[PDB]
Structure 1
Amino acid sequence: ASTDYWQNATDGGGIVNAVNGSGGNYSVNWSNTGNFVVGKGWTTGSPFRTINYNAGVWAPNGNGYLTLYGWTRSPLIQYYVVDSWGTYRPTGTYKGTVKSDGGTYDIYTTTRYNAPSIDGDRTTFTQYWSVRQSKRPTGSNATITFTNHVNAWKSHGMNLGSNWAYQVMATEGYQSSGSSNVTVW
Protein backbone atom coordinates (compact mmCIF):
# COMPACT_ATOMS: atom_id res chain seq x y z
CA ALA A 1 0.00 0.00 0.00
CA SER A 2 3.09 2.29 0.05
CA THR A 3 3.24 5.19 -2.37
CA ASP A 4 4.54 4.40 -5.84
CA TYR A 5 4.16 7.69 -7.75
CA TRP A 6 6.08 10.99 -7.85
CA GLN A 7 4.33 14.10 -9.18
CA ASN A 8 6.66 16.96 -10.07
CA ALA A 9 5.26 19.42 -12.61
CA THR A 10 6.07 23.09 -13.05
CA ASP A 11 5.26 25.57 -15.80
CA GLY A 12 8.93 26.61 -15.44
CA GLY A 13 8.27 30.02 -13.89
CA GLY A 14 10.71 31.07 -11.17
CA ILE A 15 12.21 28.47 -8.88
CA VAL A 16 10.58 25.18 -7.85
CA ASN A 17 13.03 22.90 -6.01
CA ALA A 18 11.38 19.53 -5.35
CA VAL A 19 13.13 16.66 -3.58
CA ASN A 20 11.94 13.07 -4.05
CA GLY A 21 12.73 11.87 -0.54
CA SER A 22 12.67 8.52 1.20
CA GLY A 23 9.53 6.42 0.72
CA GLY A 24 6.47 8.68 0.88
CA ASN A 25 8.44 11.79 1.94
CA TYR A 26 9.03 14.83 -0.19
CA SER A 27 9.88 18.47 0.21
CA VAL A 28 9.57 21.63 -1.85
CA ASN A 29 11.26 25.05 -1.64
CA TRP A 30 9.86 27.58 -4.09
CA SER A 31 10.13 31.21 -5.17
CA ASN A 32 8.60 33.61 -7.72
CA THR A 33 6.74 30.86 -9.48
CA GLY A 34 3.83 30.62 -11.71
CA ASN A 35 1.95 27.29 -11.17
CA PHE A 36 3.34 23.96 -9.98
CA VAL A 37 2.05 20.71 -8.47
CA VAL A 38 4.37 18.41 -6.52
CA GLY A 39 3.41 15.35 -4.48
CA LYS A 40 3.60 11.68 -3.65
CA GLY A 41 0.93 9.05 -3.93
CA TRP A 42 -0.30 6.32 -6.25
CA THR A 43 -0.16 5.72 -10.01
CA THR A 44 -3.74 4.42 -9.99
CA GLY A 45 -6.08 6.27 -7.69
CA SER A 46 -9.04 4.63 -5.95
CA PRO A 47 -12.35 6.02 -4.65
CA PHE A 48 -11.86 3.69 -1.66
CA ARG A 49 -8.36 4.73 -0.59
CA THR A 50 -7.63 5.95 2.95
CA ILE A 51 -4.76 8.45 2.65
CA ASN A 52 -2.48 9.18 5.61
CA TYR A 53 -0.09 12.09 5.70
CA ASN A 54 1.97 14.21 8.05
CA ALA A 55 2.98 17.67 6.86
CA GLY A 56 6.08 18.26 8.96
CA VAL A 57 6.46 21.68 7.31
CA TRP A 58 3.59 23.68 5.83
CA ALA A 59 5.05 27.13 5.24
CA PRO A 60 3.63 28.95 2.17
CA ASN A 61 4.53 32.66 1.85
CA GLY A 62 1.55 33.65 -0.25
CA ASN A 63 -0.71 31.39 -2.30
CA GLY A 64 -0.30 27.61 -2.01
CA TYR A 65 -2.52 24.57 -1.33
CA LEU A 66 -1.95 21.45 0.77
CA THR A 67 -4.33 19.04 -0.90
CA LEU A 68 -5.24 15.61 -2.15
CA TYR A 69 -4.89 15.96 -5.92
CA GLY A 70 -5.77 13.50 -8.69
CA TRP A 71 -7.32 12.72 -12.05
CA THR A 72 -9.79 10.44 -13.76
CA ARG A 73 -10.52 9.88 -17.44
CA SER A 74 -13.88 8.82 -18.92
CA PRO A 75 -14.70 11.51 -18.08
CA LEU A 76 -11.67 13.80 -17.68
CA ILE A 77 -11.89 15.29 -14.18
CA GLN A 78 -9.28 16.80 -11.87
CA TYR A 79 -10.15 16.72 -8.17
CA TYR A 80 -9.07 18.22 -4.86
CA VAL A 81 -9.42 17.65 -1.14
CA VAL A 82 -7.86 20.83 0.27
CA ASP A 83 -6.83 20.63 3.94
CA SER A 84 -4.73 23.82 4.21
CA TRP A 85 -3.62 26.80 2.15
CA GLY A 86 -1.64 30.05 2.42
CA THR A 87 -2.98 33.56 1.94
CA TYR A 88 -5.85 32.50 -0.37
CA ARG A 89 -8.63 29.94 0.24
CA PRO A 90 -9.83 28.45 -3.13
CA THR A 91 -13.54 28.49 -3.97
CA GLY A 92 -15.98 27.71 -6.78
CA THR A 93 -19.65 26.96 -7.42
CA TYR A 94 -20.99 25.92 -3.98
CA LYS A 95 -22.79 22.57 -3.85
CA GLY A 96 -23.06 21.76 -0.15
CA THR A 97 -20.85 20.48 2.67
CA VAL A 98 -19.38 17.15 3.84
CA LYS A 99 -17.97 16.20 7.24
CA SER A 100 -14.91 13.93 7.19
CA ASP A 101 -11.89 13.28 9.45
CA GLY A 102 -12.86 15.87 12.01
CA GLY A 103 -13.46 18.69 9.52
CA THR A 104 -16.29 20.30 7.59
CA TYR A 105 -15.52 20.85 3.89
CA ASP A 106 -17.31 22.96 1.31
CA ILE A 107 -18.05 21.15 -1.96
CA TYR A 108 -17.37 23.08 -5.18
CA THR A 109 -17.28 22.62 -8.94
CA THR A 110 -15.20 24.68 -11.34
CA THR A 111 -14.25 24.29 -15.01
CA ARG A 112 -10.99 24.98 -16.89
CA TYR A 113 -10.77 25.92 -20.55
CA ASN A 114 -7.73 26.10 -22.82
CA ALA A 115 -5.91 24.43 -19.97
CA PRO A 116 -3.11 21.83 -19.50
CA SER A 117 -4.30 18.36 -18.49
CA ILE A 118 -2.83 14.94 -17.91
CA ASP A 119 -3.22 14.01 -21.58
CA GLY A 120 -0.55 16.61 -22.35
CA ASP A 121 -3.04 18.60 -24.43
CA ARG A 122 -4.68 21.97 -23.85
CA THR A 123 -8.36 21.28 -23.35
CA THR A 124 -11.43 21.68 -21.14
CA PHE A 125 -12.21 19.71 -18.01
CA THR A 126 -14.34 19.91 -14.88
CA GLN A 127 -12.82 20.09 -11.39
CA TYR A 128 -14.37 18.70 -8.23
CA TRP A 129 -13.36 20.10 -4.83
CA SER A 130 -13.75 19.60 -1.12
CA VAL A 131 -12.17 22.58 0.65
CA ARG A 132 -11.93 22.57 4.44
CA GLN A 133 -13.84 25.48 5.97
CA SER A 134 -10.85 26.34 8.18
CA LYS A 135 -7.22 25.23 7.94
CA ARG A 136 -6.40 21.76 9.25
CA PRO A 137 -3.58 21.73 11.83
CA THR A 138 -0.33 20.32 10.46
CA GLY A 139 2.59 18.44 12.01
CA SER A 140 0.71 15.38 13.26
CA ASN A 141 -0.62 12.33 11.43
CA ALA A 142 -3.74 13.15 9.44
CA THR A 143 -6.24 10.97 7.57
CA ILE A 144 -8.29 11.67 4.43
CA THR A 145 -11.08 9.12 4.18
CA PHE A 146 -11.58 9.78 0.48
CA THR A 147 -14.74 7.62 0.21
CA ASN A 148 -16.58 10.25 2.25
CA HIS A 149 -15.76 12.90 -0.37
CA VAL A 150 -16.55 10.64 -3.33
CA ASN A 151 -19.95 9.79 -1.83
CA ALA A 152 -20.87 13.41 -1.05
CA TRP A 153 -19.80 14.41 -4.55
CA LYS A 154 -22.03 11.72 -6.02
CA SER A 155 -24.98 13.15 -4.10
CA HIS A 156 -24.41 16.45 -5.90
CA GLY A 157 -24.09 14.93 -9.37
CA MET A 158 -20.28 15.04 -9.36
CA ASN A 159 -19.44 11.57 -10.70
CA LEU A 160 -15.82 10.59 -11.26
CA GLY A 161 -14.56 8.78 -14.33
CA SER A 162 -14.05 5.05 -14.70
CA ASN A 163 -10.35 5.30 -15.59
CA TRP A 164 -8.32 6.32 -12.52
CA ALA A 165 -5.02 8.12 -13.04
CA TYR A 166 -2.66 9.36 -10.35
CA GLN A 167 -3.71 10.35 -6.81
CA VAL A 168 -1.25 12.28 -4.64
CA MET A 169 -1.00 14.39 -1.50
CA ALA A 170 0.28 17.59 -3.08
CA THR A 171 1.74 21.04 -2.60
CA GLU A 172 0.32 23.33 -5.29
CA GLY A 173 1.63 26.87 -5.64
CA TYR A 174 0.58 30.01 -7.53
CA GLN A 175 2.93 32.96 -7.96
CA SER A 176 4.37 32.66 -4.47
CA SER A 177 7.29 31.55 -2.32
CA GLY A 178 7.39 28.95 0.44
CA SER A 179 8.48 25.61 1.87
CA SER A 180 6.76 22.29 2.53
CA ASN A 181 7.76 18.87 3.78
CA VAL A 182 5.11 16.12 3.58
CA THR A 183 5.09 12.38 4.28
CA VAL A 184 2.42 10.24 2.60
CA TRP A 185 1.35 6.62 3.08
Structure 2
Amino acid sequence: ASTDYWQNWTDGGGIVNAVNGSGGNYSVNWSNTGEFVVGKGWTTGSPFRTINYNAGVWAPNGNGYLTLYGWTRSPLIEYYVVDSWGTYRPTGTYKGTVKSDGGTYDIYTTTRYNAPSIDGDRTTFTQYWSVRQSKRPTGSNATITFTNHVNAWKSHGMNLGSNWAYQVMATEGYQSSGSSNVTVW
Protein backbone atom coordinates (compact mmCIF):
# COMPACT_ATOMS: atom_id res chain seq x y z
CA ALA A 1 0.00 0.00 0.00
CA SER A 2 0.99 3.57 -0.60
CA THR A 3 1.72 5.66 2.52
CA ASP A 4 0.02 9.00 2.91
CA TYR A 5 1.46 10.36 6.17
CA TRP A 6 4.92 11.59 7.11
CA GLN A 7 5.76 11.69 10.87
CA ASN A 8 8.69 13.91 11.84
CA TRP A 9 8.54 15.14 15.48
CA THR A 10 11.40 16.19 17.75
CA ASP A 11 11.18 17.66 21.32
CA GLY A 12 13.93 19.92 20.05
CA GLY A 13 16.87 18.16 21.63
CA GLY A 14 20.02 17.52 19.54
CA ILE A 15 19.94 16.81 15.83
CA VAL A 16 17.34 14.74 13.98
CA ASN A 17 18.07 14.69 10.21
CA ALA A 18 15.02 12.93 8.82
CA VAL A 19 14.75 12.54 5.01
CA ASN A 20 11.26 12.06 3.56
CA GLY A 21 12.30 9.54 0.84
CA SER A 22 10.72 8.14 -2.36
CA GLY A 23 7.35 6.38 -1.77
CA GLY A 24 7.28 4.58 1.61
CA ASN A 25 11.07 5.10 2.20
CA TYR A 26 12.75 7.30 4.79
CA SER A 27 15.98 7.68 6.68
CA VAL A 28 16.91 9.19 10.09
CA ASN A 29 20.37 10.18 11.14
CA TRP A 30 20.43 11.46 14.66
CA SER A 31 22.89 12.94 17.06
CA ASN A 32 22.76 13.33 20.90
CA THR A 33 19.08 13.83 20.90
CA GLY A 34 16.12 14.45 23.23
CA GLU A 35 13.05 12.42 22.22
CA PHE A 36 12.00 12.18 18.55
CA VAL A 37 9.76 9.98 16.43
CA VAL A 38 10.01 9.78 12.59
CA GLY A 39 8.22 7.37 10.27
CA LYS A 40 5.83 6.73 7.42
CA GLY A 41 2.38 5.33 7.22
CA TRP A 42 -1.21 6.55 7.31
CA THR A 43 -3.23 9.56 8.48
CA THR A 44 -6.00 7.24 9.73
CA GLY A 45 -4.88 4.21 11.70
CA SER A 46 -6.81 0.93 11.90
CA PRO A 47 -6.71 -2.07 14.15
CA PHE A 48 -7.24 -4.06 10.96
CA ARG A 49 -4.28 -2.75 9.03
CA THR A 50 -1.38 -4.85 7.87
CA ILE A 51 1.94 -3.05 7.92
CA ASN A 52 4.92 -4.22 5.91
CA TYR A 53 8.42 -2.75 6.13
CA ASN A 54 12.00 -3.41 5.29
CA ALA A 55 14.64 -1.78 7.44
CA GLY A 56 17.69 -1.58 5.18
CA VAL A 57 19.70 0.12 7.96
CA TRP A 58 19.14 -0.40 11.70
CA ALA A 59 22.13 1.18 13.52
CA PRO A 60 21.06 2.94 16.78
CA ASN A 61 23.99 4.03 19.08
CA GLY A 62 22.14 3.92 22.34
CA ASN A 63 18.41 4.08 22.97
CA GLY A 64 16.28 3.73 19.81
CA TYR A 65 13.26 1.77 18.73
CA LEU A 66 12.21 0.29 15.36
CA THR A 67 8.50 0.23 15.99
CA LEU A 68 4.94 0.44 14.73
CA TYR A 69 3.63 3.65 16.38
CA GLY A 70 0.37 5.43 16.59
CA TRP A 71 -2.43 7.06 18.53
CA THR A 72 -6.09 6.77 19.30
CA ARG A 73 -8.44 9.22 20.96
CA SER A 74 -11.45 8.40 23.21
CA PRO A 75 -9.43 7.33 25.05
CA LEU A 76 -6.03 8.85 24.22
CA ILE A 77 -3.53 5.98 23.90
CA GLU A 78 -0.04 6.00 22.35
CA TYR A 79 0.81 2.44 21.18
CA TYR A 80 3.78 0.45 19.99
CA VAL A 81 4.78 -2.76 18.38
CA VAL A 82 8.48 -2.78 18.84
CA ASP A 83 10.44 -5.17 16.58
CA SER A 84 13.99 -4.04 17.38
CA TRP A 85 15.81 -1.58 19.65
CA GLY A 86 19.31 -0.35 20.55
CA THR A 87 20.85 -0.58 24.00
CA TYR A 88 17.52 -0.36 25.92
CA ARG A 89 14.65 -2.82 25.60
CA PRO A 90 11.39 -1.10 26.55
CA THR A 91 9.38 -2.81 29.30
CA GLY A 92 6.63 -1.88 31.76
CA THR A 93 3.77 -3.62 33.54
CA TYR A 94 3.76 -7.22 32.18
CA LYS A 95 0.35 -8.29 30.83
CA GLY A 96 1.15 -11.45 28.85
CA THR A 97 2.52 -12.34 25.36
CA VAL A 98 1.34 -12.66 21.75
CA LYS A 99 2.70 -14.68 18.79
CA SER A 100 2.54 -12.76 15.51
CA ASP A 101 4.57 -12.89 12.23
CA GLY A 102 7.03 -15.48 13.49
CA GLY A 103 7.84 -13.54 16.63
CA THR A 104 6.70 -13.69 20.22
CA TYR A 105 6.16 -10.28 21.86
CA ASP A 106 5.75 -9.35 25.52
CA ILE A 107 2.78 -7.18 26.27
CA TYR A 108 3.20 -4.10 28.56
CA THR A 109 1.43 -0.97 29.84
CA THR A 110 3.17 2.17 31.05
CA THR A 111 2.03 5.69 31.82
CA ARG A 112 3.55 8.99 30.73
CA TYR A 113 3.19 12.10 32.85
CA ASN A 114 3.41 15.80 31.77
CA ALA A 115 4.48 14.62 28.24
CA PRO A 116 3.83 15.85 24.69
CA SER A 117 0.77 14.30 22.95
CA ILE A 118 -1.41 14.93 19.91
CA ASP A 119 -3.69 16.95 22.17
CA GLY A 120 -1.24 18.98 24.23
CA ASP A 121 2.25 19.64 25.52
CA ARG A 122 1.78 18.39 29.09
CA THR A 123 -0.39 15.33 28.96
CA THR A 124 -0.83 12.23 31.09
CA PHE A 125 -1.75 9.13 29.08
CA THR A 126 -1.40 5.34 28.93
CA GLN A 127 1.02 3.66 26.56
CA TYR A 128 0.33 0.12 25.19
CA TRP A 129 3.27 -2.04 23.95
CA SER A 130 4.04 -5.29 22.27
CA VAL A 131 7.82 -5.71 22.44
CA ARG A 132 9.44 -8.59 20.63
CA GLN A 133 11.22 -11.05 22.98
CA SER A 134 14.43 -10.87 20.84
CA LYS A 135 15.34 -8.33 18.21
CA ARG A 136 13.79 -9.04 14.80
CA PRO A 137 16.46 -9.45 12.07
CA THR A 138 16.41 -6.47 9.75
CA GLY A 139 17.04 -6.03 5.98
CA SER A 140 14.45 -8.53 4.67
CA ASN A 141 10.79 -7.74 4.14
CA ALA A 142 8.87 -7.96 7.42
CA THR A 143 5.20 -7.78 8.33
CA ILE A 144 3.29 -6.63 11.43
CA THR A 145 -0.19 -8.12 11.37
CA PHE A 146 -1.51 -5.52 13.74
CA THR A 147 -4.95 -7.12 14.29
CA ASN A 148 -3.10 -9.94 16.19
CA HIS A 149 -1.67 -7.37 18.58
CA VAL A 150 -4.97 -5.46 18.99
CA ASN A 151 -6.82 -8.69 19.83
CA ALA A 152 -4.25 -9.78 22.28
CA TRP A 153 -4.28 -6.33 23.92
CA LYS A 154 -8.08 -6.54 24.14
CA SER A 155 -7.89 -9.99 25.81
CA HIS A 156 -5.86 -8.35 28.64
CA GLY A 157 -8.19 -5.33 29.10
CA MET A 158 -6.08 -2.96 27.04
CA ASN A 159 -8.80 -1.26 25.01
CA LEU A 160 -7.91 1.20 22.29
CA GLY A 161 -9.85 4.37 21.56
CA SER A 162 -12.59 4.74 19.01
CA ASN A 163 -11.09 7.67 17.12
CA TRP A 164 -8.01 6.59 15.26
CA ALA A 165 -5.22 9.10 14.61
CA TYR A 166 -2.08 8.46 12.54
CA GLN A 167 -0.28 5.09 12.37
CA VAL A 168 3.33 4.75 11.14
CA MET A 169 6.30 2.42 11.02
CA ALA A 170 8.74 4.54 13.10
CA THR A 171 12.22 5.07 14.35
CA GLU A 172 11.98 6.62 17.85
CA GLY A 173 14.99 7.67 19.89
CA TYR A 174 15.90 9.22 23.23
CA GLN A 175 19.21 10.42 24.50
CA SER A 176 21.14 8.72 21.72
CA SER A 177 22.65 8.90 18.25
CA GLY A 178 22.38 6.61 15.23
CA SER A 179 21.11 5.84 11.72
CA SER A 180 18.10 4.05 10.27
CA ASN A 181 16.59 3.53 6.85
CA VAL A 182 13.16 2.03 6.46
CA THR A 183 10.72 1.40 3.60
CA VAL A 184 7.06 1.03 4.56
CA TRP A 185 4.05 -0.31 2.63
User: Tell me, which stretches of 5 or more residues in structure 1 are unaligned?
Assistant: none
User: Tell me, which stretches of 5 or more residues in structure 2 are unaligned?
Assistant: none
Return the TM-score normalized by structure 1.
0.99
Q: Helix, strand or coil for the counterpart of 2:120?
A: coil
User: What is the distance in 2 between the residues matched to 1:120 and 1:29?
Assistant: 27
User: What is the distance in 1 between the residues matched to 2:59 and 2:121?
Assistant: 32
Q: Deviations over 1:7-42 (max 9, x none)?
A: 000011111100000010000000110110000000
2:133 aligns with: 133
Return the TM-score normalized by structure 2.
0.99
Percentage of matched positions with identical amino acids: 98
Q: Helix, strand or coil for the counterpart of 2:137?
A: coil
Q: Deviations over 1:135-168 (max 9, x none)?
A: 0000000000000000000000000000000000
2:76 aligns with: 76
Shift of 1:120: 2.9
Q: Deviations over 1:104-137 (max 9, x none)?
A: 0000000111111011331111010000000000
RMSD: 0.6
Shift of 1:91: 0.2
User: What is the distance in 1 between the residues matched to 2:113 and 2:174?
Assistant: 18
Q: Deviations over 1:60-88 (max 9, x none)?
A: 01110000000000000000000000011
User: What is the distance in 1 between the residues matched to 2:80 and 2:56?
Assistant: 21
User: What is the distance in 2 between the residues matched to 1:96 and 1:144?
Assistant: 18
Shift of 1:94: 0.0
User: What is the distance in 2 between the residues matched to 1:95 and 1:140?
Assistant: 30
User: What is the distance in 2 between the residues matched to 1:39 and 1:123?
Assistant: 22
Q: Helix, strand or coil for the counterpart of 1:161?
A: coil
Q: 1:34 to 1:123 in 2, by over 3 A?
A: same
- State the aligned residue count: 185
